Design an enzyme around this catalytic site. Structure first.
Site, PDB file in Angstrom:
ATOM      1  CD  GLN A   1      -3.180  -0.848   2.212  1.00  0.00           C
ATOM      2  OE1 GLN A   1      -3.268   0.010   2.911  1.00  0.00           O
ATOM      3  NE2 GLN A   1      -4.014  -1.813   2.192  1.00  0.00           N
TER       4      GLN A   1
ATOM      5  CB  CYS B   1      -3.852   0.374  -6.075  1.00  0.00           C
ATOM      6  SG  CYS B   1      -4.020  -0.663  -4.622  1.00  0.00           S
TER       7      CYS B   1
ATOM      8  CE  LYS C   1     -12.587  -3.788  -0.864  1.00  0.00           C
ATOM      9  NZ  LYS C   1     -14.049  -3.306  -0.670  1.00  0.00           N
ATOM     10  CG  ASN C   2      -5.409   0.730  -1.078  1.00  0.00           C
ATOM     11  OD1 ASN C   2      -4.089   0.552  -1.174  1.00  0.00           O
ATOM     12  ND2 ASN C   2      -6.216   0.895  -1.958  1.00  0.00           N
ATOM     13  CG  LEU C   3      -8.505  -5.520   1.896  1.00  0.00           C
ATOM     14  CD1 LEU C   3      -8.473  -6.877   2.103  1.00  0.00           C
ATOM     15  CD2 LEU C   3      -9.754  -4.726   1.881  1.00  0.00           C
TER      16      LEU C   3
END
Lengths: 89, 88, 88, 88, 88, 88, 88, 88, 88, 88, 89, 88
Positions: free
Chosen positions: I12, I17, I34-36
């Site tokens: 991240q 992404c 998508k970033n978790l």
């Protein structure tokens, strides 16, 4: 987190450069802008971590790209603003 | 000036358009990549000639996901200024 | 209530499309002015036949940057509402 | 899995394109309906062939404002994700 | 041409505006449906009169969530191209 | 007030989300239809409870392209003002 | 420094709103031209009063497509910075 | 429920509309603050009543840049869902 | 034909992404990265199984800014038409 | 090719920027007009050098609302593709 | 620079809260989102310096706001993604 | 009535620009706050002298996240209309 400024000169506008630079940044997780100056130069400002600014500085020099980059001058920068993405102009 | 390229092959649905436009915006080119009904992709591109030659050579040899069979460069005389490189 | 126009000459890249689209927005007309690969400009415009005549005239002898050589009105049976007067 | 259709009759400015997109999007289809010069409407759907059949049938029998004289299927080798169900 | 409609009853916030705008786009109409401070809905729609009759009928007896009590067709002499069928 | 609906069956790819968001906007509701990983479609909808029974019913037996196998009414204590009826 | 004008005659759907706003923006002005039910056009400008007089005059004598019967200055007490010169 | 507020004073050009909608959005309200021709600002607001009271109170007493002289609340009824709190 | 991938490691804020999105777009795919909360990216792509294979490979081995530790493939049933290739 | 123009006089707020971008888009040019802190307007314009001499002319003698005192032509070595004719 | 996550519960949706929060954050130089959850809660994620995350944390608690904030539970977060502005949902 | 303002200190990345732009919009002003390379924000505002005064005041003594050191007032001759209150 830190932002650098670079002044690239040579055959650098109109040769996909502000796009490639943009794209190449985003790929290194950077944010900033590549702006077309009147003299014929391109002023690129990017912000990320310093080793990610090195990689871009390195790209800006020797990287494979359409442009004929004659010089890149790094300039000190004190701006700590959150730029959105990596914009052309 | 502007050049026109008919690409035939396995060109639709294989990121061909995206990729072509990516490649063009990187050369300083402007134009489009339109999906044609027969199955081909039309590619119109404007820039300096040596750049369109570059692009042409990519369309032929360039590493891509698509399976290119032929690349015909049609003549024609459009002198419009295109926006970016769009996918129509 | 739409007509088709095939303007030929030195009409691309010379403001002709912005200009025409403007001149027709002043006549309360709708339609488009699309750039063609042969160097022509296809102008389609919808409105009262009289404003169409003003515009047909304007395409020919009106003042504009473009060097217009020939304007060929074509028939059209086209009853879709065009929003504005776009370019291409 | 993308079909072309040519629809003819009284079919422009009668909501047809719009209703067609709406019927398509319900079926789960993607594509466009375009207004052609000759009067006809070029509708290109894309999906599972049953849905594509369902739309063929709606194009023919479906309760609608337009008066549809003929619907001619044509063949397409379009292999492309179309965003919505645009009107053109 | 264009007509104005003053729909009254339980007609706000009950889908009625979305619905009418939908139903009007299917008859190939343009115009709007605007929420009024007394609780009424003003519907202006522009088209061929026969489509306008269809819409006028629709407002009254059509199936729809809203409980319509009355529709008073007004004069309106407006000849402006409305883009689509907006809400408010 | 808002409710949560887990629909399962053949619900993705079949225009179910659009059609739901359509029906919603016709009954005056606000909400979203989110496409889930398991293959279900999560529908959240807000409004007067009677209108929510119409949707909960339309989710069951309402004519549609999707093949609905089960509709699962979940308890929602949300009160956010949702935009239109978004497809997610 | 904002005036309200009511223009009357054959003024709607004859490029008047559009030509007006153009003339305005050339003059440095901000405001709108709104289409009214009765037929007339509500133009509201904002600038220096000279530029406001210039527009008065253009509204009266100006070469334009519309046939302008009356132009009645009508006095406003409004400050609000209107961004462009909208059509409504 | 929706309410209406005519605010008279020195209300135009003084951040009054911006500030009003800022304040509303913070109370969970929806609506609009429209500059009127007389010089007042109309404010339509929807929410729970006890929130419309808050706004009414801020409208009268609340710290601002504008110079409020009278704050009349008018006839409520109007049951539409407004998107945000806008300025017009 | 929509595979989900939980990518993990230093992934991240490193262009992953964006980059992943450009690679899936290059392979003709649609989807999202998508970033978790845990630190992980969940990438969801939909294309042909082989195009999904090229991507699963890239996530693993491909030249990239990030330091991938592990790419797991989770199973999916979602048969939805994702727009382009977003980032969440 | 591109050029730089510093226009001084009574040029801000008098619609000069717009009117410049209009003459611009009419001659087929691309570029921008930027309002400067000193009170001058910097115009950049790109195209054939004959069209530049046209714009350069119109900046001096052209019929316009602005009161133009002086127009300085600067060295522009630029080459960038500009979008419309933006106002900055 | 880092991110935290907060779960604020009580009378919190439909009462201008997600707007205020976004707004309050933006004033503190933060980026993130306020997301309406199904249970009735509001999930807030915000990113910036830790003393700026305190200020928001402190805001969320006692700050004057329409909502009736019953509990604020701070949660650990390992995400280091550049979020654009401060969004609702 | 367009003042320029060079603010300094720890004023970038601290919400200042957002906040300034909000204060100015509250004061009925338009303009921008842009971030400069040296570390400084240059805020340009335009409105009535007193509104430009409260702002100058707020810039100095107003509650804000930033650590303002020195606020200089500068220039200006900008007589241009600025949109809303931007950030650059």
């Amino acid at each position: 987190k830190q932002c650098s400024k670079f002044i690239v000169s040579g055959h650098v506008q109109g040769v996909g450069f502000c796009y490639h630079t943009s794209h190449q940044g985003l790929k290194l997780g950077l944010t900033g802008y590549a702006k077309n100056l009147n003299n014929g130069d391109v002023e690129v400002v990017a912000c990320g971590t310093p080793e990610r600014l090195e990689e871009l500085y390195l790209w800006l020099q020797e990287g494979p790209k359409t442009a004929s980059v004659r010089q890149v001058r790094r300039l000190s920068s004190e701006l700590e603003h959150d730029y959105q993405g990596f914009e052309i102009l």
